[PDB]
Design a protein around this ligand. Sequence first.
Ligand SMILES: Nc1ncnc2c1ncn2[C@@H]1O[C@H](COP(=O)(O)OP(=O)(O)O)[C@@H](O)[C@H]1O
Lengths: 11, 143, 343
Amino acid sequence: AXXXXXXXXXX
Amino acid sequence: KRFKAGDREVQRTMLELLNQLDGFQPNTQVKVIAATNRVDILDPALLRSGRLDRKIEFPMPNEEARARIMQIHSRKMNVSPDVNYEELARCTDDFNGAQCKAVCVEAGMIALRRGATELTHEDYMEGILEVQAKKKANLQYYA
Amino acid sequence: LKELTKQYEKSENDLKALQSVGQIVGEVLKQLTEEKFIVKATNGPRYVVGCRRQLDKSKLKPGTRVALDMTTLTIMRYLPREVDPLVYNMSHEDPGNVSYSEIGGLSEQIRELREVIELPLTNPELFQRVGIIPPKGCLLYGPPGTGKTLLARAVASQLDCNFLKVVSSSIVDKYIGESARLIREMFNYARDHQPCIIFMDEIDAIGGEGTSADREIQRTLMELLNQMDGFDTLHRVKMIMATNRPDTLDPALLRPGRLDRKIHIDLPNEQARLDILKIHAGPITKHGEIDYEAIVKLSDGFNGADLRNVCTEAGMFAIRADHDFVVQEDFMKAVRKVADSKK
Ligand SMILES: Nc1ncnc2c1ncn2[C@@H]1O[C@H](COP(=O)(O)OP(=O)(O)O)[C@@H](O)[C@H]1O
């Protein structure tokens, strides 16, 4: 359910 | 919807469009229409008062609609005069109209492999199995 | 020669204009001393700069935009705060001017909501005269479409105070802590723009248990509750959080200074149907007399939002027929269209 999310970085 | 990430460029595009839509009042010959397949991700701002507020609802077609829809995309083909499009609709459920066209296009193809000119009712039914990737096998326990 | 002169004088200003240079627009962010600041270019390094002698030392407070010279890097003049519709916050959503009279049949309820919301914002003296902190917050519960929002929208229109509308159900996004954050940005936005009626739509979602996601609802309530009776700043903004289900709302949310007044707004008042139609019917040209009474029973349990459509949908019937509504026969079918087709 509750979902922790990572993230990238468009330069 | 929204989200310094690299989406602060499309955000300017939306607010710009958001800006002009409210810029001009009704009574004008600039009637606007916008199409989206996922209206649960659109900004609430995009649909509040002076923006696309009267929202048009496009349903997944009903059974009678499907029988018609499967006709319009079959006119340009030499479909046999005995093809109970109605019966086809009954077998064609949970079908978006585009898929309702896929049967027609698939129906013509299935005839091709069989070396026929007019699409028989069976060809249409085989499309209704190959439009959804199903492969009809004569299972034995039926008889 | 007279025509040549006025253009020639303008041209002379242009010759001076060619000479004039540009100033790198920037923002100040600290004041180390009486002659030093830390200014940042809009897309540029942070240069330590001084201020021109003919400038107000004071006016340049953190956040004060300036346009420093392009070579000296010394600020040469303040500027107004940049204004752009880059705002992500409904705050700019003008309520639009809606008079209280336009909402119909809620005289008592509108009267109450005036009290709690309007009073602390307009005549604070009354509250400070008696010594009670101004009441803050009204909880408007009622059947959907009855027009809870409009009353909350008219109150903004009379006070001429900015209105922020949050669809409360939307704020509860799936990823953890986003739901608390949207509420936090709302109240934080209010501190910047005062005074704003923070109208929360159906509040049952956030207020009113053992799962990771079953406590995210718990956290979001705690964030909402804190930002109200909360250390930081008590504030002067007001909230009109309106629900459809009042049993669900948690007890703390209904308290004196934490959202009081359970104003009930039931389906359009029996007499209102007239007033509502009165306020919503007359606009559309319609010379023919009206048997409104039959329309009233022809429209029992009508959501009121339906009533707005009733007249408008009738206008579409008129848009076909001819161009002038001259028959109640229209509202009858319009009443049906705004009933069976509104089911
Ligand atoms: N009782 C009412 N009086 C006046 N307008 C109403 C009423 N009920 C609905 N409306 C109309 O519907 C809208 C307001 O409905 P809204 O406040 O969103 O309903 P709710 O908040 O109860 O779901 C406006 O367009 C308004 O003109």
